[PDB]
Amino acid sequence: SGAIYVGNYRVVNRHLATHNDWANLVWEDSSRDLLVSSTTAQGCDTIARCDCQTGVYYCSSRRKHYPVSFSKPSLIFVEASEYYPARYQSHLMLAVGHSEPGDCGGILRCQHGVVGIVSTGGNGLVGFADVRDLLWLDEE
Ligand SMILES: CC(=O)Nc1cccc2cc[nH]c12
Ligand SMILES: CC(=O)Nc1cccc2cc[nH]c12
Ligand SMILES: [Zn+2]
């Protein structure tokens, strides 16, 4: 589990969005496994605006923050999960590291702020759904 709270937006894995997230939908993209919903309260998080390829992610299945190198956001074939059939996932960054399904929502951070959230993995990889291209999360 996990979310990003920036301005009056909540950014979650689409596959973990709640009833309230759908009722209060701002934007979602199945191919990215992202959903953004509106919030009452102001969030404290900053979104990175950068092309960093190094950062730190939170892995709930290890209770550990791991420094990683990751690929630039790309279109990657992802095997079937509980939530999606086997398909190409877009805006996805890969790193060598530990990931289990319930690690989804773990934040990946760089010096500039939030880079993305855990969305995929296994096989000794972790995949993050990038948010840095979503410039509108910084306004309105
Ligand atoms: C932009 C980018 O990928 N830079 C990068 C690479 C490796 C380490 C660090 C520490 C800060 N930035 C780092
Ligand atoms: C959607 C989903 O289940 N994502 C996910 C994240 C991290 C690791 C794994 C291993 C299978 N699936 C994973
Ligand atoms: Zn950065």
Please give the full DSSP string across 70-123, using - where no structure is assigned.
Answer: BPPSEEEEE---SSS-SEEEEEEEEEES---GGGTTPEEEETTEEEEEEEEEET
Q: Determine the atom of ligand 1 nearest the C-alpha atom of 51.
A: 1
Is residue 21 domain-shared with residue 80, that is, in the same domain? no
Is residue 19 domain-shared with residue 53, that is, in the same domain? no
Tell me how many domains the chain contains: 2
Q: Which domain holds residue 24?
A: 3-44
What is the DSSP code string of 3-64? EEEETTEEEEEGGG--HHHHHTEEEEEGGGTEEEEE-SSPP---B--S---EEEEEEGGGTE
Is residue 72 domain-shared with residue 21, that is, in the same domain? no
Is residue 34 domain-shared with residue 95, that is, in the same domain? no
Resolution (A): 1.2
99 CB under 6 A from ligand 2?
Answer: yes
Is residue 134 domain-shared with residue 76, that is, in the same domain? yes
Is residue 67 domain-shared with residue 115, that is, in the same domain? yes
Mutational test site, ligand 2, from 14, 76, 100, max ligand atoms within 8 Å of CB = 100
Nearest CA to ligand 2 atom 3: 101
